[PDB]
Each structure stands twice: as C-alpha cells, then as structure tokens.
Amino acid sequence: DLKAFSKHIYNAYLKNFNMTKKKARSILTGKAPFVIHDIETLWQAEKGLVWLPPYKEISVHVFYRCQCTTVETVRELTEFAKSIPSFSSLFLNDQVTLLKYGVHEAIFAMLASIVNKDGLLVANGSGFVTREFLRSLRKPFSDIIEPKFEFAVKFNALELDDSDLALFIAAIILCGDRPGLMNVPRVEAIQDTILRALEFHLQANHPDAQYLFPKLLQKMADLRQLVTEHAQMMQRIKKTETETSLHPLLQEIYKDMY
C-alpha cells in the first residue's frame, strides 16, 4: 500500500519530468555542455548552439529565459500533480490553488538537481550557464538568482535521489494551509499520507542517514521563506523595471502574494 503509493508517485515523476537528477548528474560529471559565461558565449548559444519579447538588454533576456523555464516546469508539475493519488479527485479550483502557491517551492527544490556551485544546466543540459556570469547581470535581476544557488548547494548536500524527490515535490504541492483552499481536510489528509510515505521511503533508501526526514521538513519551511522573498523581489522588478515584461501565467501567480 504505502510502497505502492510511493511507486506511483515515482512513476508519475519519471513520466512527467524530462530532466531527472540522475540524467543531470551524469552530464555535470562527465559520463559535454556548451559553457555560457559571457555575452559572446550566450549569443553563440542563442545562435543554434544550445537553442520571446523583443531584445531589450542582456540582463532582461536572461530574466526572460528564467520565465520560460518556469512556464515549462509548471506544465510538467501540473501533469505530475494530476497523476498523484486523489489530487485529481479535488475540485479543479482547489487543484489550481495548490499549484499557484506550490509551483515555485517545487521549482526551487528541483533546480538543485541541475545546479552546482559553479553554474546551471540549461536547455536539456546542452548548455551550462556559470554562476559568475549570472552574478555579473544588472540589478535587480542579479538579486533573484544568487539565493537559489545558496539553497541548492546546501539542499544537494542531503544527496537525495529521484525516488526521494518524487515524494518531496508531491508533499510541497499538496499543502493544507495554502490561502483560499476549499477542502482543507482532504488536502491535509493527502499530505499526511505523502509524508508518511516519505518517511517510510527514507528509512529503506537512506538507512544510515541521521535526522533526514526532519531535515527535509525544515527544507520545506526554508522553501516557503525563499519563495516569499523571491515574490517580493519579483514585485519590485514589476515596479522598477516598467519596460520589462512578465509572462501572464507568472502574473496570475504573484498577484496576491506578500
């Protein structure tokens, strides 16, 4: 039962996410991606090497590429969630509420799978943008990038695998205290099942890991704080960068966050 619950989550994870942490770790080690570290390498990458509103500047273009990856990951998270036991049994408005307040927590957790202390895989791992180059971007666009590296480095130290992350992201999405949730008891019930499955799974998968389950619970609290700060940065970019576009899907997500 509880193994069948976890296996179903793991299969929905492998089915709906093109880039897994296993595939990504093979690329980042050497089992090669074009390194993007300045304007010239980025232009070459955008000229067919690796791969939107009109080109404004270098920092805004990268900002636009960040939005694009979010839109694509929301599509995958929506299909992943719809393959979760009794997520589809929720009314559609509750499904949207869980995705609205959960996608960025899940996105920032899954970014760790394609991130190291030096940079980030882009476009199915065919490219690799460096942390140094992303730091060099203009403000406020550089402000939204570095905190994700800091979280991802410490999160990768826990050495979770795809089977772990499948339950971890499922627990992020099915969160009982999202604002405006209609059927809170049902969501809390599903969440409690996922957390039990997660603890059960971590026992077999990481028998030597000390305090791993409460460590992951703390990571979930960290992710909510990371998203709150990110949402405030995004709202200031919306205020101060009036010529910079925001994808309509992201506009609906950040509308009421404070």
Add this chain to the structure above:
Amino acid sequence: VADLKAFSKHIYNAYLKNFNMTKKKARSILTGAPFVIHDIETLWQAEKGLVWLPPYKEISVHVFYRCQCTTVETVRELTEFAKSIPSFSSLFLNDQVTLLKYGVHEAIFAMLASIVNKDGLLVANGSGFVTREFLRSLRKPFSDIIEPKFEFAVKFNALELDDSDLALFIAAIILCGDRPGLMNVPRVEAIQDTILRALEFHLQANHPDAQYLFPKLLQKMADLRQLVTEHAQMMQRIKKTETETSLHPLLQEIYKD
C-alpha cells in the same frame, strides 16, 4: 468541413461519456414510472427510500439544499466534459477554472431543459418527478429562483434540440472568450469559433428544415447569460436574508464576485 464533422463527433462522445442523464433518456421517461413529488408527504416518502446534506431546517431550505447538490454533481460532470474537449485541456489549469466558474450555470440551466416539462422536473436519475406547482408553493425567496428556469426551459425545448446538438451548444457555452480574468483570450476565442462553426455545420445536417436555428441558439446563449445574472442576484438576496441557510463551499467560490 471534413474536420468539423469529426470535431463534432468527438464532442458528442464526450457528452455521452460524462453526463448521467441525456435528453433522449429523459424524454423517454417523461413519455412512458417516476414517483411524483407534489407535497410534503410525498417528498418525505421520496427521501425515505422511494427515490433517494446539511442539518434539516425546513422544507423550502431542504429543496434549496437539493438544488445545490445537483449543481455540485453537474459541475463535476461539466469539468470532465470540458476536459475531453479538443484544446480545452491544453489551456493552463487556471484558465480552465475561469471558464468553468463563469460557464457552469449557463450550461446547467440549458441542460435543465432536458429533464423539465411544463408540469415539473425529473429528480434522482429520473426515479422521481417533482411538480412545478409544488416547487411554486415553496417559501420566498426560495421559490423565486425556481420559476424562471421552467419559463426558460419550456421555450428552449420548443427548439427540439437533441443530445448531439446540445453537446456542441454546451461546449460553446464553456469555451467563452469574454469571461472575467481570462488569461489566454485569443486561444479561447479561436476554440469557440471552431465550436460555433461545427455547430452551424451540424445544425444544417441534423435539422435541414429548421429555419434560423443557429442564430436562435446564439440568442439562447445571450438569454442564458441574462438568466444567470438574475439568478446570481437572487442568490445574493438569499445569502443576505437567509443567514441560517448554508451554501455549499463550491458554490461560495463560484458566486464570490
């Protein structure tokens, strides 16, 4: 032209797959038997097992609660119907909820005509029939919301649509481009235009002698928006003046501004 016939058939199959009651099944029941509910005693009989919730209050509120129940179940079926429609599922989930939020009541009142005649209304999968006169005898403001639906339904049933017609008509109601807060307006308008073209084509083949049928149905869509507007006003009065009466949570989200 060739894609339209297949597009229509796919929508009809989604109709037959997801709705508990069709107009074909309903009209055969209404012509010959359902237990007739016409007063308090028959209604109690129906609840005790002959035919079939928040805590009881009174008879008019109990019928009001059963009205909410049929809406909740029809929203479930309309959501599965819409999800089987071409390119509805391709919209982001928040656009799907917006279309359903502002469309389900227009579609519900259109589909209500299938189980209504001038004398009353089928209930509980057609095993019951509640009379129009009994529903009229309920306490205001609860009897206020019932009678205009009969009035719309009898005039709507005069058009003599069948289920294949209604499948496209319901799809056009849901895929409405001017719903408040719609994100991808051009994509919804494009899907609606395809449905309206499929509907026009379908009406020519299925009702070859029917005059002005397609613009009549477009007018019915406008009538349905006015019917829902007046209904929401009446629901606001019930929410204001009947404070002891509960409103199902799904309906609170639909009627929230």
